[PDB]
Symmetry: D2
Subunit: 292 residues, 4 copies
């Protein structure tokens, strides 16, 4: 639910750019079959940026329905305005989602005090578990360990998706929070390392197209079988890297289509179709993982 | 008008975080009297992030009304979803604004091709002049000179607010575009250097509180009197730096309150009030500028 | 010998800037008593930059003598000219040192091919074990894992001191080299993490003044007792950080004097005496570690 | 002479890596005929790193002899140990050189106070004019404008080669120093911008192969004819960038060989021969410049 391999699931679209219900069902069945621990619905990989709040909510509710109690669903609820983050969060109160993934405000670059006040206010307007999400290369700001420790004192703030790729954060945060605060990687290429350092899992892009391997890798990691896990990680490493050869989720949506998991690889502008060079790059990474 | 000193104006708020018409009127009278070339309404400094589109529109319309033809108004119209950017632009058709300031999509990190398609689509569906806006430290992406060159060929894409603070961009862009394409600094601390290299003005935070000096400095720069302009810049430099000692627009709103230009220095979360240390830093910068 | 806690030992000086034999003896006895695994003589922390090759060699030979077979000694042998690195290395052939610590050429920024040719040539002129040393913030270049794997095929190239602070390097290098290739941290603040990821020890600055704790921490780490080790690491973390409050080895030399381990904290220009603020900072970190 | 186009001259070598007098003569005749203001002998581009002090001295003396009063010679005298820098400077007293180019200590990363004491001590023990040299990407340290300001008060510290490529440094330094303190670019790609902001010339790698164009460009810049200068800069820009496609001076020595200016393109390790891909890149840049 908040450990193991969690997929940051794509929002499959038809050629018109609207959610494709048949493709979403196919993906969710695949994750249930694959042993994926949970689904993050309309996070970064799910094109939260280009979906309006109504469309965002429709996708989450549809995912919840299709999941049909077979796998937990976490809604993406991040916003760079606190009032807006509260409003979006309130849409999913009493919905059936098990928690929220809420990113540090992007673009307006709040202070550490501002981040504290932002997340505290959000948590105070919901009973839903809150997972913080730090990704400075996308947001322009960096939620530091000290502020994480401060927020972890709030009752329903229960974990962090740490996507810096800076592995020193694991033990910097861990020593500042209680033993049941969840530490999740948001960086596929360093996620096994993250887990070896004491992390509890990964919210993953790679898991969209290698769900079984990812689930297997995180199981081995949790059991301390890191050498065995590294064999899988090595098989997956080219995808960990090349799924960002062009901006996420352009590569992973193409990979889904290629594996027959979705009907179309359509995205919304300003995301654009994958280049020819990108195709071959991603195809080779799929081949290396033994999926094509 | 798209040259000289252009103010990225604050959106002055009462204690409930709602637009204060009386303070806004005062600021606009101040800029008319101080020789400011134009007003950017609801840009980054105007808290575009924490205003909804209705409020955003209201502020712009109120700004136009109060300006009453005495000073040109440019609307912030940027969005990280192309469809949203387009529809926000439609709100201002035949409103009376002279142009739009439109930022590179933030948070979703489109490719150069994606940025091209984004701005081309926006420009397609309006007659309004478009000023591109690059600020990688806030957005997570960087509109490179090559792409600015491609976009400058679009009839109503007329200029760029370049806020990297990387001065090599001035002539990299200039050689790729026509002589009437406007190059504007979005980094106060390097804006005079920017103009000396060939830039045509600045979209300024400092101009909020040092409007006359900024107008004069920019005019001198345009006339090639860089030594004379630089004496003014030296007095203003502490302000250029310290107006970002805490997240913009926290320091500049406090400065406006201290000068009596606005009733309150209230912002919306996740912006928080200025620290005591910040007050002292900014106050010292204001005195260095001869404003207090 | 090439695992556990290895000290990058200071070169204690008299007020005239020459090696202080009594202080060096005191330090070496302290490391023998403390359980330090080995000494690195005239590395970065030993002021290799400001000692000429004759003085460098005198210090190494003196350290060897004073060690008197009680603790292994590794000579610093790095140089940014390959011929110069060979010459320096040859001075210690048949000396009694157990190996060499050789840094990537600094200042002239060689390619990965250049680094390969540099280290290969050096290794070919000695029977002594060679430990590569990567520290891009000091050298201006970065020896990447792929090139490390390539060099690890050379018989007497047996390990790396990895001082990037980038923990992803551990498993990137490990998968490219044989199981007996040694992986050592060159970054005190991340060294336990480094070991938890599969590293075999640390070449340490902190160990100069907390040798017993460091030796104890690395023992626990090697035995897999990481939680117990973290208690020590937490006690030492302020030293891990504050021993670089001013340029290394200015802080650690002052700390040695303060603990009575050396007679004077004298350095050679361009290193300068510790500031008053630096003193108090380092004193507080010593207090936190329970040493003062 | 410390203005205009100053060449950071290669040290041409035979196939054994020894200085080639005949090639050096050719280069010097070339620079006398091409209007180059001065020659920097055994700077970074002259492979200062892999020449010993005797060879270093020999090259400078040979350069002075060959120049035969027709062009001023500046000696590279930088070292990361103050004592070494001082004694290297003494080798050139009454040699006939007009000044020294002395880099910030590399690898040992002194503080600003350390840099101050370093250069002050060097300047104390000579009558020769001293040109400071800042290049953080190579040295690991950054001589900031404040410290340049302090150092400029020393009688015979007369200028700075600023190689950050950060153009804000021009006027940050200029406002802290006297009007006759010389500001020279050490970054070819931004050198014209640098001069347009107030800089007095460039110490150039490009000038090795494009001496006449560089002389003319710099003269135009000094006369304020930036548009005219910039036409030349545009032809040279590929060369400005691609002469660093592989580590300097690998590309520029190859270019010199290709033009017939030197007999061989041989370097000393850890510099290695140019790759085939590099040949093609540099050759295309030379043709763009109209040199082939
Ligand atoms: K909690
Ligand atoms: K245009
Ligand atoms: K080996
Ligand atoms: K002077």
């Amino acid at each position: 639910m908040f450990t193991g391999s969690i997929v940051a699931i794509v929002t499959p679209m038809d050629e018109k750019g609207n959610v494709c219900r048949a493709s979403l069902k196919k993906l969710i069945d695949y994750h249930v079959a694959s042993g994926t621990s949970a689904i993050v619905s309309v996070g970064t990989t799910g094109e939260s940026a280009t979906l309006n709040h109504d469309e965002h909510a429709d996708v989450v509710m549809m995912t919840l329905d299709l999941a049909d109690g077979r796998i937990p669903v976490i809604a993406g609820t991040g916003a760079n305005a606190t009032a807006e983050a509260i409003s979006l969060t309130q849409r999913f109160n009493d919905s059936g989602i098990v928690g929220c993934l809420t990113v540090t405000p992007y673009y307006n670059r709040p202070s550490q005090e501002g981040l504290y006040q932002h997340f505290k206010a959000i948590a105070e307007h919901t009973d839903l578990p809150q997972i913080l999400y730090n990704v400075p290369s996308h947001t322009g700001c960096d939620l530091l360990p000290e502020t994480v420790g401060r927020l972890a004192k709030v009752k329903n703030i229960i974990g962090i998706k740490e996507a810096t790729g800076n592995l020193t954060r694991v033990n910097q945060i861990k020593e500042l929070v209680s033993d049941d605060f969840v530490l999740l990687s948001g960086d596929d290429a360093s996620a096994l390392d993250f887990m070896q350092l004491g992390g509890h899992g990964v919210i993953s892009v790679t898991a969209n197209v290698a769900a079984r391997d990812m689930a297997q890798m995180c199981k081995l990691a949790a059991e301390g079988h890191f050498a065995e896990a590294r064999v899988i990680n090595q098989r997956l490493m080219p995808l960990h890297n090349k799924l960002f050869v062009e901006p996420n989720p352009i590569p992973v949506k193409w990979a889904c289509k290629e594996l027959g998991l979705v009907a179309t690889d359509t995205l919304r502008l300003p995301m654009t179709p994958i280049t020819d060079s990108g195709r071959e790059t991603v195809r080779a990474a799929l081949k290396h993982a033994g999926l094509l």
